[PDB]
Symmetry: C4
Subunit: 454 residues, 4 copies
């Protein structure tokens, strides 16, 4: 019938044009704009909260490194290790003697938790004899703990076994009180640090690094956010249901052309002419709404102090706000002069992906080559992750002279890998800057002329 | 009438063409060139003066940090803090004992000002008990000062309260004499420093940073600039009045087409055909003249020693000289071969702004996403200011490998934010370098061809 | 005959099209895909092995620098030297006294090798008299060794001759046992370090640098890889023989057109019409197969502990995997929409090489100029290698501000080389960024339009 | 006459085409190729000589800083200063006591020169009273020397006057013998250092920096280059005379068209049709020959030990070799496919200069603005030289994040210059990267199409 062709002309016409005919001023538009504003304000007010939470942990952890580590100035987290026997002993006894007299030496209300369990782990039968090259090593690990309670030889006379040694760990806990919350006129948030000091001897290289790790677990001692959080779940869920009804109309009006192309005998057209009917942005909207309400329920769990994980709530709210922001562009394309420029992206996106395959093959070629060859001689080419980050930083040009000076200084070791380094880096840089990037310029330019001139 | 169409042909014709007809060689041109030269010379002679003023304050302030701070080598302004109890006491008593014997230890004529008022600020009732989680904190701040006069136990027996502590400040003043002015054969400029040493304990993290701040207030003890300053106010004010008469002729000859398009019945054309009549550069000239004379009156107030603020005079003279310089281009466009190239900018400026909206939406998307997600795990993503500076530095390519190595080193903490970091940074960099920047190249190129071929 | 024109139409048709006619589904295709996969897995499993081998040597060598060198913190490999007489003596006696008591001071099973041969090398007749400017120097080198055996004055009373001195070297060896292999449940790999400490006085400048060098030689004490290695030699050799038969058909069907262009009288066409017949990728395949089997036989020699050289096996496997990866593109060009984009590279590669000559002449001009002129005054322009690396890093833009600040700080020495530095660097940067790189953009763009429009 | 039109056709035809007609195979071509080769070899053999000369001075000067300066580790040339009274005294007495016992403490044959003249310079009448603000300062400088001869109270009891002080300088000289020349089997080159230690108190800021400066004067104690140097002066002078005869033919055959355009009545054409007749590369050749022979005569003066100045010989030989290298391009343009690409540069060079004016005006606008405004608050914007180097490093993108972090850290001081810093740097970077650089791309592209299509 000719009536069902008129069923399409409502759905195909823009929301801007449907004020003259039916006189329905859009509320769905206003729900979209309110959803933008309410999500972004919810993101900012959450993010400032974690800013004041994280800097308290970071500043206390630096304060523990200056209290419990022997000879520590900042800038030496990684390159800090014990190299002699007495230096490892004096590191251990400095840590515990700077634990027992804590409240005088500290600069806060660091209280104890009922405490310090020192322990070393050595192999069951570590028999090593490089004067005979015969051995008998039993890989069972023997834990050997010792207990320390705060208010000598019960703690002293501690004897390591340096011919069989894996780790020396120190566990204790400290409870403090956050003081900024009392300025903010609220219920305080007492923290409980879990300090772990580890003398790792994993590789057995004659070098024992030292590192300190903490972990907190907040619990309350003796609103505007919560009302705003039930708003952001309510409006965004209503947008989920409303545009689910729009997908309902798409999937039900799909059949009335398939019926209609059998009576008109439209030859049962393939994938594209049923692809060009449904939608182009409401998929982005519906995954924004699922992602938003999952993050906000997770946030209510966070700030009601049954929390245990900052990671999932942060990543879901961040990705949700990102997709809500790129949902603005579809309102820009209702104007003509913007619709040309956005159409340049869609006519250029297939050909730029067809070229992206031919780039990634050669790029992975130089990754696998440079990692094995310049691995033992450079320091930015240790693992394949660092190789891909280094080469892709050199595509645009970030750090060329430091890589060339690293191969210039030590001469690799032989002349062959230096002669290979010059040819490797010059061929790579001159390939991808001059030819490949200029093909990206030519593809976007030709796509612009194609969308322009007819 | 046909006579009023001839009223337009004088105003519409260039200043270069009006030497043949009326024989008036331009003086308005020469006032513009003199205004360029006199403003720039006034800027340079002012800027060299503040160069010798600022380096004296900077070098003295470094000299105070080496005199009054315990164990200070340069490069440690930020990461310098007290971590134990005796270190904070020895920092205070080092500061005052390096104040009392000042003239032997100093390397100048540092005189005293009648002096040192040491003080600490503690809460009214600071009751903290982490062994009970009960408390009573009164947020009233109790100031507790003590006075020190230079030529023990009146200053000694100073007892802090480390369970209730906010700040420990030290105020004193020092007067010296600038010696370079006597070489310049003039009246000297005695300075008065206001040294503030602060032991901040704001966040209560177990870490008390130390910083020193000074402030000067110049006052005289027992020309060519001033004549040049009354010149630069006089000529620039005359240009303000002269081009105000040009805007007067524009606003009065506007009506004689509006009358004329009612008798010819020109249908009362909209905004653009009355926009294309007035001017295109004299708005820039008139705001240059207002800005110049405001800055120069401010400068006379500065160098007549009733000064109090370097900020407004510096920013007004700087912006005024900038706009005077970009007023040169309108003399370049009287030639034909330059007029083509300047017309490329005006035909490309609308479309590049229409594209600038579609860039800024996606860019603010990646800002709000990256700040919350990679905030607690990176160090360049602490606040939203640092995120926008970091991402916009990565648009052109500044510091890619340091951001990738920061996420490579600590593994974030979990595998999920590392796996998210790789996808976030690779998608962002490959978006804005390859596609968006190439659209900027294509837009300026198509605008050039549009202005060229007809 | 017309039959021999049909001999060409099989060889000229694609492998994809020969399933409809003869019904031979391709196995040569599947040998190519298996050759890609097996080479890359062989590369990765080899590269992870050398990762755990290299970090053991690197961490032990850092541990020897902290044991045997006086006052060594990391970051001071290069700028570390002895400047007085007693400092060189105390460096030597610290090295040997930290050798004799090794097992207490060490943190491993460092055993001895039966040992320490200290030696100095002085000239035969070193007569120097700057108070007379007369001399007699005999360039014969007198080696003067001394022997030290571990469990005073036999080693003490060592007297240098500082008026005639070249080198002071210290040789000893240490055997340790790698402990990670016992966790990996295999036969261990005992290492033997060859520590060389050298006090170089080559240039005789009053500055004796200190450096430590090690060298290992692995030997066993008291599979899946090997089966996979005989697979990777077998399949890749079979591809070598199969495509050698394809080159056989090319060289034998070449003559049946040369015969045919004498009976048709095709005028004996020159180089190009016999160049366009043979192949375009099987040269790349056959050099991939030669390179692969050479590297894998070398690898079997490596991991069967008769090894002696990591260099050739690493560089042959790396280059082989690179060429195998760029052999994927020829399967992408069987599709049409990829064939256009790959044809852009071949139509642009001649003209970009014709322009690469005209770039390299001017670039070598600025290399020879900048090296002699700014050599003694900069630090990145010491040798011609560092000049070419610095200028080519400044083509794209890496490190501009550090080079400008290096010429800004010391003022060179005179005003002339500073005035020359500004003109040199501004002319170079503004040449190659604005004009030359834009010619690369224009050449690839015009090549794209040439391949597109007909 | 028609004969004089044939006088032009010899001079206008290429050197390649004149082998068929007259049969004169070119020797002028071979003199050009020999001039390229001989100049570059002369440059390299000179530059390696100054490499071994400069590193001897640099390594000895570092050795003097470690001998004569109190507490000096490398990396602290600039930030090294005395801040108390006893530190300046102990710096002076450390310098002289590390002079008197030199030969034991040194590591070479450092002999004396008959010696150490210590001196201080104080004002004639330095009356300063900040407790009264009255003074009497006489700017006459009173030199006060003292003499020290090497093999206490004659040198001790040295009393400075810290209320009137300008400089404290120390002069002495040391003669050593270069030892590498005896390995090179030649006559040695004894050096004579002129060590200057200066305690500058110029600005009178309470901070006295310390620096050490040396200066050498080589003189001999008790070839292949020289023959090659008389070759490079001989051949290059012959090219000067030969192409002077070519300019002679140009200036004499110029008149026979000016006579000919008066009898044909060619209307006495203006500047361009007499500009297009003479030459296009022999001006470059003749200034190359003048510059080469001036540098080589200067070099003969250098290496015959009456030398006194490395600067002019280095800069003349460097610029001469540069112009000789860019003289190769005119041999490339005899081929057709290179002649198109070189013609792109000449058709694009006028329009790129017409645009270079409009760039430099706005660029100098941002220079004068940013220097006065962000001068006292940044550290890369101190002088106008550093501003132009910083902004031009930010055109391509070098160091964006360090400039943004410098304005982010200290908050300037007030919110106004931070709010101005964000607007200044974002507007500048987004102007010159997106619009101006894309105009350079469009100009070279349109010039390429103009030279291509007809
Ligand atoms: C020190 O080494 C011991 C091994 O001797 C580590 O114990 C292992 O820890 C991992 C994860 O922590 C477990 O999967 C293993 O089951 C543990 N092995 C045994 C035998 O219990 C110990 O974790 C190391 N210390 C640190 C701080 O990592
Ligand atoms: C140290 O802390 C005290 C608070 O205990 C600060 O005093 C406040 O200072 C700000 C601005 O300086 C004022 O707006 C408040 O009104 C002050 N509070 C009171 C109770 O007076 C003090 O400024 C801090 N010290 C420094 C150097 O900032
Ligand atoms: C220290 O100097 C001596 C020379 O006095 C070096 O001995 C030369 O070493 C090179 C290569 O090592 C040989 O080619 C020469 O033949 C050696 N000369 C003599 C006379 O034997 C010695 O190598 C230097 N030390 C170090 C560690 O390089
Ligand atoms: C230390 O200061 C004195 C001034 O008191 C400097 O002497 C002047 O030096 C410059 C150039 O060296 C000359 O142009 C002046 O004529 C000198 N003045 C007098 C009064 O002689 C001296 O040079 C400074 N020391 C150093 C190492 O620069
Ligand atoms: Na950098």
């Amino acid at each position: 019938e000719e009536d069902l062709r008129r069923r399409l002309k409502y759905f195909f016409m823009s929301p801007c044009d449907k004020f003259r005919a039916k006189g329905r001023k859009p509320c769905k538009l206003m729900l979209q704009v309110v959803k933008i504003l309410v999500v972004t304000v919810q993101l900012i007010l959450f993010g400032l909260s974690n800013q004041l939470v994280v800097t308290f942990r970071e500043e206390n952890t630096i304060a523990f490194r200056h209290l419990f580590l022997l000879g520590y100035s900042d800038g030496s987290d990684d390159t800090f290790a014990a190299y002699t026997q007495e230096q490892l002993y004096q590191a251990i006894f400095y840590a515990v003697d700077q634990y027992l007299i804590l409240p005088e030496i500290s600069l806060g209300r660091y209280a104890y938790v009922r405490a310090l369990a020192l322990c070393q782990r050595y192999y069951h039968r570590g028999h090593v004899d490089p004067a005979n090259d015969t051995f008998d090593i039993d890989p069972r690990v023997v834990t050997d703990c010792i207990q320390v309670d705060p208010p000598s030889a019960s703690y002293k006379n501690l004897t390591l076994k340096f011919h069989k040694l894996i780790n020396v760990t120190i566990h204790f806990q400290l409870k403090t009180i956050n003081l900024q919350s009392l300025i903010n006129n609220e219920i305080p948030d007492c923290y409980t640090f879990s300090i772990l000091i580890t003398f790792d001897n994993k590789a057995h290289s004659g070098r024992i690094p030292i590192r300190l790790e903490t972990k907190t677990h907040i619990q309350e001692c003796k609103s505007f956010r919560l009302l705003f959080d039930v708003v952001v779940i309510l409006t965004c869920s209503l947008s989920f249901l409303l545009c689910a009804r729009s997908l309902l109309r798409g999937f039900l009006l799909q059949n009335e052309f398939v019926v209609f192309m059998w009576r008109r005998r439209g030859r049962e057209i393939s994938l594209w002419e049923r692809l060009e009917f449904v939608n182009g942005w409401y998929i982005l909207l519906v995954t924004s709404d699922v992602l938003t309400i999952s993050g906000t329920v997770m946030k209510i769990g966070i700030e009601a102090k049954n929390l245990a994980s900052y990671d999932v709530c942060s990543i879901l709210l961040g990705t949700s706000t990102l997709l809500v922001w790129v949902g603005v562009i579809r309102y820009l394309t209702f104007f003509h002069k913007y619709n040309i420029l956005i159409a340049t992206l869609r006519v250029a996106l297939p050909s730029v992906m067809r070229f992206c395959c031919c780039v990634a093959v050669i790029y992975l070629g130089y990754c696998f080559c440079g990692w094995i060859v310049l691995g033992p001689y450079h320091v930015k080419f240790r693992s394949l992750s660092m190789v891909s980050e280094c080469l892709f930083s050199l595509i645009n040009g970030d750090d060329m002279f430091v890589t060339f000076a690293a191969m210039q200084a030590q001469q690799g070791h032989s002349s062959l890998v230096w002669l290979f380094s010059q040819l490797y880096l010059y061929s790579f840089i001159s390939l991808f800057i001059y030819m490949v990037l200029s093909l990206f310029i030519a593809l976007i330019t030709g796509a612009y002329d194609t969308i322009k001139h007819p």
